[PDB]
Amino acid sequence: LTGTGVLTESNKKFLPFQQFGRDIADTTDAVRDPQTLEILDITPCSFGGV
Amino acid sequence: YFKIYSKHTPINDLPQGFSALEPLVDLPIGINITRFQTLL
């Protein structure tokens, strides 16, 4: 899963079998570290029209 | 290919109300199952 974002460790209640989660757009919202039980939210890096 | 999903739950005839089953097992063993039996 290649991407870019602010990786924030997060309170999202993943069940033990759940490896990652999705937003309404079907984009990835959060992942589990493949070396740790920690769940990381993937917020998009800040954006805005100038 | 093969799966198990399950839940263990309290009761007071299979009841009304609602429940949700987590996976436990997921196997590419490719068994052509068409029949089964239970062990006590």
What method did the depositors use to determine the structure?
A: cryo-EM
The structure tokens listed for B25 are: 């097992």
What is the rounded distance in angstroms from the CA atom of residue A14 to the CA atom of residue A20? 8
A9 vs chain B: nearest CA distance in angstroms?
24
Kindly report the CA angle at B31 between B29 and B32, in degrees rounded to 5? 155
The structure tokens listed for A40 are: 């990381």
- Cβ distance A36 to A9 under 8 Å? no
Residue of B21, B22, B25 to mutate, testing the A interface (most A Cβ within 10 Å of its Cβ): B22
Q: What is the resolution of this structure in A?
A: 3.5
A contact set with B (CB within 8 A) = 15-17
B32 vs chain A: nearest CA distance in angstroms?
26
The residue type at B40 = L
